[PDB]
């Protein structure tokens, strides 16, 4: 039951310079680190983290390395700089998961009410959202096995706390606040239309690979029960919103009445005082 | 501005606009409009 | 003529009761119905000098009531005087049908499925009287309604937020538009 | 109805009284009457126009 | 039936549901107590109206042939996105 | 081509190249007036009365004494031919009154439905009607009187009878009233049909026609016209 | 031009005619030419009776969708309000 946090990308620049470490230390390709913070509410904020020297065998992938020379005494350091910003979770790159993530979560779960494996994004080219959270879950099944622990999608965002723009919005030097309705909306049209419909191509990836070469969560319990929500309105010919078309006349009512009346006042606005300034400039320039 | 073909070419009168919206309508007549009572 | 405190009788008023006639003969048209009760119900300073004239009070309270054969009666009294009082003779023709339609508006504002029988109680034989009467009230740009012969429909209508209040802006600023546009076309050459 | 204590429509044909009302729309009223005042003001600027011309 | 006429008449109900006209109302008020379908059933035409339902368990042939809704959605909302953007193309700006 | 016989208006119909900067700002006004007289004499109500209207509101000033007046007498002949015109008196120069001694009674004959007066205004003022010289007015002005009648009475009553309006306007038979109502359906003013046994019109008015999506159809033209004039004021702001 | 304007103007917006209004407005009481009208314009020769069709107007609703075409209008309308100030 966790929705969203507030994210400072400052220690994500620490993810960046540990992404500089791993390019020049050795065989470790992926960035795996430990995410400090403090549960405040269902909304949350993070101020610091750190990056473990981590190795992971390709053979029997449950081979973690989280040193307590690097945990306990560095935890003493991070406790000495502040008592507030303690552990809240950890982080690794890619989007998916590796296998050992569950045990790496359960290692530092002994310190925290809910340790979180926010899977992080170092080379962002994605179609959906950035780094995203997972909470401790016990959902097991309707079958009744020993208790499931694979941490389920209990989401997150990139929230903005406070000032920091002394740095950030001086470091912009490029960007502009679009006075919304000035192709900002069609930036959104591009991103949400194309990136939700090739997210629908990820959905047809699910609904084709789980039909051809895909078993047990094939109709898990949330494929068909959500094909309901897909079956809000999937219909065949033109889907016949017969209520909603005169109701959309009732919609377009307000919009184009403000267009006619208000934009005729906009006509008055530009045109009358524009003629004043214009013709005064014109012949009083004589 | 006379440059065209044309060099050969409310006292009782704006009340006459509503009265020529009234000229085909009930001049005064006052008896007709008082004797439509008593024929029944 | 609202005030009525300082004009008892000067050397300019040979009959203040003619001022009472002048205030009733225009208050019956222009004054609204909350204004009607506000003037001749909430206050008496004209109502003494016209409680010496009870048929005037009777006609205004019948105007406040909607009974129409006494409108014929006392409006005929007022129209006898409207011929027989000056500053009215170039002007009386609008008055008759204007007071008639001033009653006919609230008459139709009563309801919709009306007839000429329930109105002929108030009109007498207002059957082909109302033919030319109400038809030329329709054709005089007035009296928004629909009327039928043998199905005998009546209609009360016009909610104000419909089309014309949406229309009047460009009604002004099309002639006004090309007016100021040609005024901004004298500037080039 | 004429004193606005009672908002609806009576009948004589089918004998069916029906009460309903919805008067206030300032989206229409306030906007369009202020445009009428705007047009009066533009007519008041028509003499700045007729003064700069002649 | 995915199609409309979701103001269904009571006729298929009283034929194939082995129920009567006086008991279709109980048939769907007991379903209001159940809570998987909550129709706004017509009672001037006696029509049993269809609102939202709890659909099925598995239609594996329609898990395969939902393309006529899924890929329908994908390419058609994609194409009409391209059409809205293509009519507002050169205000890219 | 106006002062003489009328053969080469097809030249404007085939070679319409008539669109300059419209520079002199009154040349274009009186130009639209003259071609409004053209489309008035070809055949038109709508487009001719709107270009007459645009030339009317595009009267430059009144700084030239009574020159709008005779030319306006010949301007609103088509509005007289509409039948929906009141008395036109707001234009009247008092020095034009002694010349509109026919024309005032002519628009009075437009407001009246009398037939003997419809031809007695002609019998009284045929010489000034020749001074107009445009008996296209009188070739359709009787038809205009019957269309004024049908517009008024068909806007008036829902289910009128053809006999009521017929023997209210002296038609004397059902079948020419049928041809009137039929050519009025053909001319498309009202729905009015016939309860066919011997005539006896069964009909209706038209309220609850439409009022919401139909304004916002025309509001595209409203505000697209407004933004056209925006950009024109921009290209006029370019001048200093 | 009497008869083909009858072919137009015989039921423009009429209820129905019968044999006798055909005999009045038309002439030549019954040839194979008014029969040719009844078998040439897409006509139902009712039982001593006439109708333009069973609905006379081909049932006008025009699409039952006035929304999305004016939504495309809103696209180019907002577009023309763009690029200008």
Curated annotation (Swiss-Prot), chain A:
GO process annotations (BP): proteasome-mediated ubiquitin-dependent protein catabolic process
Family annotation (InterPro entries):
EIF3F/CSN6-like_C, JAMM/MPN+_dom, MPN, MPN_RPN7_8
> Domain MPN, which positions?
5-140
GO terms, molecular function: protein homodimerization activity
Q: Which PROSITE patterns match?
A: MPN
Any idea which residues bear N6-acetyllysine here?
200, 210
Q: Which UniProt keywords apply?
A: Acetylation, Isopeptide bond, Proteasome, Ubl conjugation
This protein's record includes keyword Nucleotide-binding: no
Something else the entry says is:
Does not bind a metal ion.
Biological role: Component of the 26S proteasome, a multiprotein complex involved in the ATP-dependent degradation of ubiquitinated proteins. This complex plays a key role in the maintenance of protein homeostasis by removing misfolded or damaged proteins, which could impair cellular functions, and by removing proteins whose functions are no longer required. Therefore, the proteasome participates in numerous cellular processes, including cell cycle progression, apoptosis, or DNA damage repair.
Q: In which family does this protein belong, per the annotation? A: Belongs to the peptidase M67A family.
Name of the protein described by the UniProt record: 26S proteasome non-ATPase regulatory subunit 7
Its gene is PSMD7
UniProtKB/Swiss-Prot annotation, chain D:
According to the record, what induces this protein's expression?
By FOXO4; expression in embryonic stem cells (ESCs) is mediated by FOXO4.
How this protein is processed and modified after translation, per its record?
Phosphorylated by AMPK.
The tissues in which it is expressed are:
Highly expressed in embryonic stem cells (ESCs). Expression decreases as ESCs differentiate.
Kindly list the places in or outside the cell where this protein is found, as annotated in its UniProt entry.
Answer: Nucleus; Cytoplasm, Cytosol
Oligomer and partners: Component of the 19S proteasome regulatory particle complex. The 26S proteasome consists of a 20S core particle (CP) and two 19S regulatory subunits (RP). The regulatory particle is made of a lid composed of 9 subunits including PSMD11, a base containing 6 ATPases and few additional components.
What does the record give as the function of this protein? Component of the 26S proteasome, a multiprotein complex involved in the ATP-dependent degradation of ubiquitinated proteins. This complex plays a key role in the maintenance of protein homeostasis by removing misfolded or damaged proteins, which could impair cellular functions, and by removing proteins whose functions are no longer required. Therefore, the proteasome participates in numerous cellular processes, including cell cycle progression, apoptosis, or DNA damage repair. In the complex, PSMD11 is required for proteasome assembly.
Q: Which family does it belong to?
A: Belongs to the proteasome subunit S9 family.
Q: What is this protein called?
A: 26S proteasome non-ATPase regulatory subunit 11
Organism phylogeny? Eukaryota, Metazoa, Chordata, Craniata, Vertebrata
UniProtKB/Swiss-Prot annotation, chain F:
Tell me which domain of life the UniProt entry assigns to the organism this sequence originates from: Eukaryota
Modified-residue entries (Phosphoserine), positions: 161, 173
- UniProt domain PCI: residue ranges: 29-208
Q: How does it assemble?
A: Component of the 19S proteasome regulatory particle complex. The 26S proteasome consists of a 20S core particle (CP) and two 19S regulatory subunits (RP). The regulatory particle is made of a lid composed of 9 subunits including PSMD3, a base containing 6 ATPases and few additional components. Interacts with UBQLN1 (via ubiquitin-like domain). Interacts with ERCC6.
The entry's family comment says: Belongs to the proteasome subunit S3 family.
This molecule's function is given as: Component of the 26S proteasome, a multiprotein complex involved in the ATP-dependent degradation of ubiquitinated proteins. This complex plays a key role in the maintenance of protein homeostasis by removing misfolded or damaged proteins, which could impair cellular functions, and by removing proteins whose functions are no longer required. Therefore, the proteasome participates in numerous cellular processes, including cell cycle progression, apoptosis, or DNA damage repair.
Recorded protein name is 26S proteasome non-ATPase regulatory subunit 3
- Which species expresses this protein natively? Homo sapiens
The shown range, given as first to last of full length, is 258 to 497 of 534
Curated annotation (Swiss-Prot), chain G:
**What's the domain of life for this entry?**
Eukaryota
Coiled-coil residue spans: none
Q: Where is this cross-link: Glycyl lysine isopeptide (Lys-Gly) (interchain with G-Cter in SUMO2)?
A: 32
* Quaternary organization: Component of the 19S proteasome regulatory particle complex. The 26S proteasome consists of a 20S core particle (CP) and two 19S regulatory subunits (RP). The regulatory particle is made of a lid composed of 9 subunits including PSMD8, a base containing 6 ATPases and few additional components. Interacts with DDI2. Interacts with TASOR.
The protein's role, per its UniProt record: Component of the 26S proteasome, a multiprotein complex involved in the ATP-dependent degradation of ubiquitinated proteins. This complex plays a key role in the maintenance of protein homeostasis by removing misfolded or damaged proteins, which could impair cellular functions, and by removing proteins whose functions are no longer required. Therefore, the proteasome participates in numerous cellular processes, including cell cycle progression, apoptosis, or DNA damage repair.
Q: What's this protein's family per the entry? A: Belongs to the proteasome subunit S14 family.
- Name-wise, this protein is 26S proteasome non-ATPase regulatory subunit 8
Q: Which organism is it from?
A: Homo sapiens (Human)
This chain is encoded by the gene named PSMD8
